[PDB]
């Protein structure tokens, strides 16, 4: 509808795949080469389905900060025959608050979904399904099951991936440029 949805559409059309694990279907952001992200609660194994293609997982790393606290972000390298468009120049370098964010999801269940979630708070600490988690973004939209892995953008920046909610609020793990230096 506006420049917010335009930026979000540009990311979804070129930089997402449908990831399937034994824990279900997830929106999965491709960042560069064969490197993508997914919520840690997807429990990525040795094999994953990517757009329904059986894919060997070359590497998978569950990120924690230097306080040894969960970040809820898994970085996956896929044995895929095609590279992603490099979108690392769209990642923020520092933790921050934002205005006018969109949350975008693409699964079997929720194809081409875009939600204007509005203002995003640098929330910080969250007890997420009982796990102490850091670097959480918070937005006041009643997000639901099927949206985890959903991409959070502002015009010009990819800022996080949806990892849960409490029925009033939704929660995203921050993406930072320093996660994807090669």
Curated annotation (Swiss-Prot):
Boundaries of the shown chain within the full protein: 1549 to 1729 of 2188
Catalytic activity: Selective cleavage of Gln-|-Gly bond in the poliovirus polyprotein. In other picornavirus reactions Glu may be substituted for Gln, and Ser or Thr for Gly
Catalytic residues identified in the record: 41, 72, 148
Recorded coiled-coil stretches: none
Subcellular location: Host cytoplasm
Name used for this protein in its record: Protease 3C
Assembly and interaction partners: Interacts with host IFIH1/MDA5; this interaction inhibits host IFIH1.
Role summary: Major viral protease that mediates proteolytic processing of the polyprotein. Cleaves host EIF5B, contributing to host translation shutoff. Also cleaves host PABPC1, contributing to host translation shutoff. Binds and inhibits host IFIH1/MDA5, thereby inhibiting the type-I IFN production and the establishment of the antiviral state. Cleaves host MAP3K7/TAK1, resulting in inhibition of TRAF6-triggered NF-kappa-B induction. Cleaves host TICAM1; this interaction allows the virus to disrupt host TLR3 signaling. Cleaves host IRF7, resulting in inhibition of type-I IFN production.
Domain Peptidase C3: 2-180
Domain of life: Viruses
